[model samples]
Target: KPDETRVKQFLEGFNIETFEMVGTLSNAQGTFALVKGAGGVHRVRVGDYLGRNDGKVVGISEGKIDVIEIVPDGEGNWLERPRSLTL
Candidate 1:
């Protein structure tokens, strides 16, 4: 088998749609999110990109993370929409 003991890289290939929120952390610096996916769990913070359609963390509040995703509007144009993850 391949290296089972290797340390996995965080956000190596993560997307907003693929992540499942588990928890959150907040401090004077900023806020962070704990999420899990098929690969593994990860800690994410504001300004962190979740890949897939250019979803980026915009805000973190209480027990939720607000993300803005740039997606095609289906008319050959792009639009920015809001998405969120709850702890």
Candidate 2:
């Protein structure tokens, strides 16, 4: 059977632009960010993936979340683009 709950696949229907970074939390577990989108505010951490292009949460700075978006380069090639969201 195919697993549909995979993080990357699950977030395929979402876009980074639609998600707003509202706040952040750092704790013993790790750093977490609050994102408000279609569903609502979601808690995400480093390594979390989002957007149809599969943007990855590479790092969490003081008040920003760094995401690397994998996008098509318009010639059947893929490229990585860095994006940031601030609280």
Candidate 3:
């Protein structure tokens, strides 16, 4: 299982700019992700749960409006909400 916090960290390294937790839910793989970003929404995959974080796009589905691209942080991470915002 992929830790939400770790996933968030991983995404941040890729310039995802995560802004909110949104929520978690079960997908075709299992309890995956449903994260909200400053720009849009996206999902995390299972394979990413257990892989060498080398900027890999594990568990990420292709051709999604939310998912712009798969990024590899190659390190353990946690969820971090964006700091800057527009009023």
TM-score of candidate 2 on Cα atoms, chains taken together? 0.75
Q: Mind giving the per-residue lDDT tens digits that candidate 3 earns over 1-87?
A: 233345434454443343343555565766545555535655555433211222223332232212223333356533322122111
What TM-score does each of the candidates earn?
0.65, 0.75, 0.32
lDDT values, one for every candidate: 0.69, 0.75, 0.38
Highest TM-score: which candidate? 2
lDDT of 2 by residue, 1-87 (tens): 112356554555777787778888878987888777768887788878767777788887667788988777778778888878787
Per-residue lDDT for 85 in model 2?
78
Q: Runs in model 1 with CA error above 4 Å?
A: 1-15, 26-30, 73-77
Flag regions of model 3 displaced more than 4 Å: 1-17, 46-87
Per-residue error (Å), model 3, residue 65? 22
Ranking of all candidate structures by their lDDT, best first:
2, 1, 3
